[PDB]
């Protein structure tokens, strides 16, 4: 019953270490104006 089904995320592990190192979308910012701790 549904043998070929990618349940667990593939990037999970990859994104796992990435998250640990807080290496996520570090894209720029559009007018901060105080507030929003980054």
């Amino acid at each position: 019953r549904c043998r070929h089904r990618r349940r667990q995320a593939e990037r999970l592990s990859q994104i796992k270490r990435l998250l640990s190192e807080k290496k996520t979308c570090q894209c720029p910012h559009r007018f901060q104006k105080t507030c929003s701790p980054i």
Partner: peptide, 29 residues
């Protein structure tokens, strides 16, 4: 309390830095 595995499974990645973007949640205090 709420599971923190769902969002991860359906996580997205930006198309600029090739990194995994984080959708707005609200707070965490």
């Amino acid at each position: 309390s709420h599971p923190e595995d769902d969002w991860l499974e359906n996580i997205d990645v930006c198309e600029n830095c090739h990194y995994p973007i984080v959708p707005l949640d609200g707070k965490g205090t």
